[PDB]
Structure formats: C-alpha cells, structure tokens
Enzyme design. Sequence first.
Site, PDB file in Angstrom:
ATOM      1  N   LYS A 168      33.259  43.816  31.178  1.00 56.38           N
ATOM      2  CA  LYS A 168      33.720  42.460  32.011  1.00 56.38           C
ATOM      3  C   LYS A 168      32.962  41.562  31.672  1.00 56.38           C
ATOM      4  CE  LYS A 168      32.570  43.040  35.996  1.00 56.38           C
ATOM      5  NZ  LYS A 168      31.892  42.039  37.544  1.00 56.38           N
ATOM      6  N   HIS A 212      36.839  40.960  47.457  1.00 58.64           N
ATOM      7  CA  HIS A 212      37.101  40.393  46.405  1.00 58.64           C
ATOM      8  C   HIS A 212      35.901  38.970  46.041  1.00 58.64           C
ATOM      9  CE1 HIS A 212      39.319  37.954  43.306  1.00 58.64           C
ATOM     10  NE2 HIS A 212      39.617  37.306  44.104  1.00 58.64           N
ATOM     11  N   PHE A 213      35.543  38.732  45.169  1.00 65.94           N
ATOM     12  CA  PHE A 213      34.430  37.842  44.889  1.00 65.94           C
ATOM     13  C   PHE A 213      35.855  36.524  44.537  1.00 65.94           C
ATOM     14  CE2 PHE A 213      30.497  34.813  45.053  1.00 65.94           C
ATOM     15  CZ  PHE A 213      31.415  34.192  44.155  1.00 65.94           C
ATOM     16  N   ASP A 214      35.991  36.103  44.606  1.00 66.67           N
ATOM     17  CA  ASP A 214      37.540  34.173  44.349  1.00 66.67           C
ATOM     18  C   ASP A 214      36.742  33.613  43.309  1.00 66.67           C
ATOM     19  OD1 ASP A 214      40.504  34.918  44.566  1.00 66.67           O
ATOM     20  OD2 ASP A 214      39.725  33.037  44.908  1.00 66.67           O
ATOM     21  N   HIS A 256      28.608  42.590  43.160  1.00 59.54           N
ATOM     22  CA  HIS A 256      27.690  40.960  43.908  1.00 59.54           C
ATOM     23  C   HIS A 256      27.291  40.862  44.549  1.00 59.54           C
ATOM     24  CE1 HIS A 256      32.061  40.145  41.360  1.00 59.54           C
ATOM     25  NE2 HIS A 256      32.310  40.798  42.578  1.00 59.54           N
TER      26      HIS A 256
END
Length: 124
Positions: free
Chosen positions: A41, A119-121, A12
């Site tokens: 992905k 984690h990218f929410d 990210h």
Amino acid sequence: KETAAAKFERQHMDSSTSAASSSNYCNQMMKSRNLTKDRCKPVNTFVHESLADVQAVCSQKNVACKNGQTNCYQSYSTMSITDCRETGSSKYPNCAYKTTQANKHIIVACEGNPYVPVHFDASV
C-alpha cells in the site's frame, strides 16, 4: 468477512503507543497489520488515540470528503498521527516506508449504525 469498521481499526488505529518511536515504526506496523499482504500500500496513516475519541469524530464537523462525498467529519482537536509513505527502495514483498510523526486534525468518512469511521480521508 471483515467489516468496514473493523478494517478501519486494523488499518488506522494504534491506541497502544503515543507516537511512532523510531524510523522502523511504519515498516513493522504496515507488515503486522497485514497491509502489505497482496501488494505494498503506498500510503497509510496510523492514529495514536483511544478508539472512543476517534469514533466521536463522526459527530464533529461535517465536511466534504476529498472525492466530493458529504459523509466526512473533521476532528475539532488535533490528534497524534503517524504518516507512512512508501520509499524509493520499497519492492514487494519487502515493502519499505518512511515514518513521519505529526499532530493534525483528521478527516474520516462515517457510516452505519452505530455511525462510525470506515475510511481515513485526510489529515490537515
């Protein structure tokens, strides 16, 4: 093996550019960051800020994660991001994405000590 914090940087962060420069940005970055190694992905977001500003979000607005967990944080400021979404012609191993540039607040999940994003929410 790769840590969860190092994997969030690889998946990210893109501090080297201020914004996506052309429609090819997602195709090149998804491939170069190895996110299309085993499969394409479907979605991924890159954040064009310094790592210190993104790590600081862990001490900003605590919010629930979309899955209900409570270790998520929302940035107080909007950030420059790039959304990459798989297109209709995408077919492993030639994964294809549409590049979308936007300025939004980001939501991440944080863990450990030091407490950092893993984690990218979401972006909102």
